[PDB]
Amino acid sequence: GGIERVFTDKARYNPGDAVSIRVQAKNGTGSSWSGAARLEIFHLENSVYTSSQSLSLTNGQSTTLTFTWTAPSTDFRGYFVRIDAGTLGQGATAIDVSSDFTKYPRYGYISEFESGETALESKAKVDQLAQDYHINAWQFYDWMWRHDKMIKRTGGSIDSTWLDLFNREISWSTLQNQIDAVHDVNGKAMAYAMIYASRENYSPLGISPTWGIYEDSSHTNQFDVDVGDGSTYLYMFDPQNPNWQNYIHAEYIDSINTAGFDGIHVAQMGQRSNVYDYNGNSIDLSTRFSPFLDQAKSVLSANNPARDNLTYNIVDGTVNGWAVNDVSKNADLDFLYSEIWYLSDSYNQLKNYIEQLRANGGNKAVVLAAYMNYADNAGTRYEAESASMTNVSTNTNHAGYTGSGFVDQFASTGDKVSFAINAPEAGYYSLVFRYGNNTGANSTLNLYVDGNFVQKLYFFNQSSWGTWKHDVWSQVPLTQGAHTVELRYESGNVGAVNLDSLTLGTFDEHSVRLADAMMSASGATHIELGDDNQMLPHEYYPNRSKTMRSSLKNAMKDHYNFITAYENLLFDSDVVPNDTGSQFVNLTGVSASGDGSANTVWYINKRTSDYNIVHLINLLGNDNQWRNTASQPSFQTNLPAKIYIGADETISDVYLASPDLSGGETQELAFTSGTDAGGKYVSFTVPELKYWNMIYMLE
């Protein structure tokens, strides 16, 4: 398919906006090509536009066609887009018509703001997410100077740079440029801010400890957060206290008006117990965010209804988890957001949590933060003891190492380890080192790639020498083919390490497709893409300890088209579970389950006013954790399926759309029904199941 890309200028359109569908093509079949480009746009199963254009290309040549469309007056509609060019190829994209991003958030992030970033580089990184995945809002992570003094001013004047709490340079022009670029794609820019945090030494800013929350009832220890340099701390505060609300809401408003943000992403540290105010009163923090969020929304909307967007992080998401009910039910948020840790590990546990959220929020959209392959050091491993070491030998004395051993006593000047690696395709590669360090402090080593120094690299001190870690990395660009990565213990390097391996930090395509399918099926979206086409590997968004390869980038384009086009079926306000009916799916040859059981095909049972919807999630040959890496599922071809229904439900037609299958185009299938011992049925053959099928049946 030498139809290379299909996309749109903007990332969400309004009803009646012009819409420019672009089509990048390129002939590479030896000799000229003449024919047409047949654009066809669907709403679920109904073609609603069709158009054609002449196209001829010599061998080798490229062009970009524009097709122009008018978004239909019906607000809040997702559309599939087909382009066919006969033997040249095909491609696809989706279009979302919504006056408001908060009905169908597709949430990304920006976390870098270097002053070396030209306005053009800024526009290019934003355009890529907008075009490839239809992002409609970006969370700006760690843009602020201080958590309690977000825009840094000298007098009245705004400082053109400032240093954030890990000492990064944040550039105001870069920041402003990004927000404009976001705004070009009719994007929205959400500002990160904590609900309760000041930085240290907050008194001369006129913040009062009397507004604080405390570990005890003598106001002797304020809750805090050691960021870990001995100076830099977050101190926590009472969200219901009016003076705190006043102080911090003011900086919220300052950010909207001064920086041009469209709303605020309010965060929190999560759960805390046996909590007191300054005066000594015991208080349940879990119920206290809703009042603050309510008042937040109220001043944001008075300040400016066009830029009054709001959400809150419900941290450690699970069914009836901490502050889960109070926030989701009573907090005046525009869409719900939750960071999942280790209390919803099964695909099913997580399906049930999203379900609770949708229920409690009145089917208002849910986004999850769920960092994939977090625990796992995934990607291609290059063993340190297979490699080329100057002045150091292998050992096997401390345990937990991988392959045959590791390199010891990387202690002394002129020590060296060199990895002869190969990079399948051009692009960014995460260099992830597994190490030991029990020196007593940080150890350092210098990182050379292809004879050039990249970085000094700090290895953290650990409990024992038997304690291995892989949380030291460097992202570097690479041409396809052989390359040399080496560490040198040079002059200025300190301490010592054991070295176990180099891994090319890579997200695992299989886990991720499944995790996303699961979430979208269940009714959610996943903040997972940001900056220059990075995927989110950690809670600290600037972490680049893992990269997607072309393969997963393709999968996500397919996926994000999918949850854009069929968004009315996944996320609309009347898309509810279809649970009360002993409902059952029968599959010939393969065992199924409705509770996401390892090594099965998981049917999930949802419905709307007009459609009966089954999702199938191929867990064949794979376990039931959502977060861990995975094997390629057992691909099923020509698969007989049987679906049961209520006696008052007759099926006009039956459709199956899947992102694993023709970019997610809908296909109609052959089917009749009858009746038998286990209720009234309907049946058909599933042509292919790979990762995720969305069967939707019109009634």
Ligand X SMILES: OC[C@H]1O[C@H](OC[C@H]2O[C@H](OC[C@H]3O[C@H](OC[C@H]4O[C@@H](O)[C@H](O)[C@@H](O)[C@@H]4O)[C@H](O)[C@@H](O)[C@@H]3O)[C@H](O)[C@@H](O)[C@@H]2O)[C@H](O)[C@@H](O)[C@@H]1O
Told to check if 406 binds Ca ion by CB under 5 A, we report yes
Would you say 237 and 283 are in contact if contact means Cβ atoms under 8 Å apart?
no
Smallest distance, Na ion to C-beta of residue 368, A: 16
What are phi and psi for residue 101, nearest 5 degrees?
A: -70, -25
CA 590 to chain CA mean position, Å: 32
Listed residue (671, 685, 682, 696) closest to 639, CA to CA: 685
The number of CA neighbours under 13 Å toward the Cβ of 161 is 12
Give Cβ neighbours of residue 87 (< 8 Å, ≥ 6 apart): 29, 33, 35
Cα separation values, 555 from 134, 515, 519, 548, 658, Å: 14, 12, 15, 10, 11
Smallest distance, ligand X to C-beta of residue 165, A: 6
Q: Are strands 107-110 and 529-530 parallel, antiparallel or unpaired?
A: parallel
The number of CA neighbours under 13 Å toward the Cβ of 195 is 29
Told to check if 316 binds ligand X by CB under 6 A, we report no
Q: DSSP states of 445-471 as a string?
A: EEEEETTEEEEEEEEPP-SSSS--EEE
Would you say 587 and 641 are in contact if contact means Cβ atoms under 8 Å apart?
yes
Give Cβ neighbours of residue 77 (< 8 Å, ≥ 6 apart): 43, 96, 97, 98, 568
Pick 540 or 635: Cβ nearer ligand X:
540
Residue type at 14 in one-letter notation: N
Instruction: Map 496-531 to HEC letters.
Output: CCEEEEEEEEECCHHHHHHHHHHHHHHCEEECCEEC
Pick 236 or 643: Cβ nearer ligand X:
236
383 contacts which partner out of Na ion, ligand X, Ca ion, none, CB within 5 to 8 A by kind?
A: Ca ion
Q: Residue 489 CB: number of other CB atoms within 10 A?
A: 26
Would you say 2 and 60 are in contact if contact means Cβ atoms under 8 Å apart?
no
Told to check if 267 binds ligand X by CB under 6 A, we report yes
Residue type at 86 in one-letter notation: G
Pick 181 or 194: Cβ nearer ligand X:
194
Told to check if 228 binds ligand X by CB under 6 A, we report yes
Told to check if 657 binds Na ion by CB under 5 A, we report no
Give Cβ neighbours of residue 579 (< 8 Å, ≥ 6 apart): 605
421 contacts which partner out of ligand X, Na ion, Ca ion, none, CB within 5 to 8 A by kind?
A: none
How many positions of this chain bind Ca ion (CB under 5 A)?
7
Smallest distance, ligand X to C-beta of residue 686, A: 38
630 contacts which partner out of Ca ion, ligand X, Na ion, none, CB within 5 to 8 A by kind?
A: Na ion
Pick 228 or 678: Cβ nearer ligand X:
228
**Number of helices (H) and strands (E), helices first, in the chain?**
9, 49
**CA–CA separation, 84 and 2 (whole Å):** 11
Three-point CA angle 583, 690, 515, nearest 5°: 75
Binding residue for ligand X, selected from 236, 350, 369, 619, defined by CB under 6 A? 369
Pick 199 or 615: Cβ nearer ligand X:
199
Told to check if 540 binds ligand X by CB under 6 A, we report yes
Smallest distance, Ca ion to C-beta of residue 499, A: 8
Binding residue for ligand X, selected from 539, 610, 623, 699, defined by CB under 6 A? 539
Smallest distance, Ca ion to C-beta of residue 420, A: 16
Site for ligand X in 409-468 (CB under 6 A): none
Told to check if 471 binds ligand X by CB under 6 A, we report yes
Told to check if 112 binds ligand X by CB under 6 A, we report no
Smallest distance, ligand X to C-beta of residue 540, A: 3
Task: Choose one: 285-293, 535-543, 575-583, 609-617; the region binding ligand X (CB under 6 A).
Answer: 535-543
Task: Choose one: 121-129, 329-337, 382-390, 411-419; the region binding Ca ion (CB under 5 A).
Answer: 382-390
Smallest distance, Na ion to C-beta of residue 389, A: 36
Smallest distance, Na ion to C-beta of residue 510, A: 8
**CA–CA separation, 282 and 123 (whole Å):** 50
Pick 524 or 620: Cβ nearer ligand X:
524
Task: Choose one: 98-106, 252-260, 405-413, 614-622; the region binding Ca ion (CB under 5 A).
Answer: 405-413
- b/e 369-383 (16+ beta carbons within 10 angstroms → b): bbbbbbebbbbebbb
Give Cβ neighbours of residue 573 (< 8 Å, ≥ 6 apart): 103, 362, 363, 364
330 contacts which partner out of ligand X, Na ion, Ca ion, none, CB within 5 to 8 A by kind?
A: none
Pick 97 or 370: Cβ nearer ligand X:
370
**CA–CA separation, 214 and 274 (whole Å):** 9
What are phi and psi for residue 161, nearest 5 degrees?
A: -135, 165
Pick 620 or 643: Cβ nearer Na ion:
620
User: Can you tell me whether residue 361 is helix, strand or coil?
Assistant: helix
What are phi and psi for residue 618, nearest 5 degrees?
A: -75, 90
Told to check if 142 binds Ca ion by CB under 5 A, we report no
Q: Nearest residue to Na ion, using CB?
A: 630
Smallest distance, Ca ion to C-beta of residue 549, A: 23
Site string for ligand X, 2-41 (x = CB under 6 A): ----------------------------------------
406 contacts which partner out of Ca ion, Na ion, ligand X, none, CB within 5 to 8 A by kind?
A: Ca ion
Told to check if 248 binds ligand X by CB under 6 A, we report no
Smallest distance, Ca ion to C-beta of residue 375, A: 19
Told to check if 538 binds ligand X by CB under 6 A, we report yes
How many positions of this chain bind ligand X (CB under 6 A)?
15
Smallest distance, ligand X to C-beta of residue 473, A: 8
Place of tokens 């209720």: 679
Site for Ca ion in 468-507 (CB under 5 A): 500-501
Told to check if 620 binds Na ion by CB under 5 A, we report no
CA 157 to chain CA mean position, Å: 36
Task: Choose one: 203-211, 271-279, 487-495, 536-544; the region binding ligand X (CB under 6 A).
Answer: 536-544
Binding residue for ligand X, selected from 339, 500, 531, 572, defined by CB under 6 A? 339
Would you say 189 and 175 are in contact if contact means Cβ atoms under 8 Å apart?
no
User: Can you tell me whether residue 358 is helix, strand or coil?
Assistant: helix
Binding residue for Ca ion, selected from 355, 383, 486, 567, defined by CB under 5 A? 383
Told to check if 466 binds Ca ion by CB under 5 A, we report no
Pick 235 or 571: Cβ nearer ligand X:
235
Rg from Cα positions in the chain: 27
Task: Choose one: 437-445, 472-480, 516-524, 617-625; the region binding Na ion (CB under 5 A).
Answer: 617-625
Told to check if 630 binds Na ion by CB under 5 A, we report yes
Site string for ligand X, 113-152 (x = CB under 6 A): -----------------------------x----x-----
What are phi and psi for residue 690, nearest 5 degrees?
A: -115, -70
Cα separation values, 220 from 202, 276, 374, 431, 629, Å: 16, 11, 36, 44, 45
Site string for Na ion, 295-324 (x = CB under 5 A): ------------------------------
Smallest distance, ligand X to C-beta of residue 566, A: 28
> Which residues here bind Na ion, judged by CB under 5 A?
622-623, 625, 630
> Which residues here bind Ca ion, judged by CB under 5 A?
383, 401-403, 406, 500-501
> Which residues here bind ligand X, judged by CB under 6 A?
142, 147, 194, 228, 267-268, 313, 315, 339, 369, 471, 538-540, 543
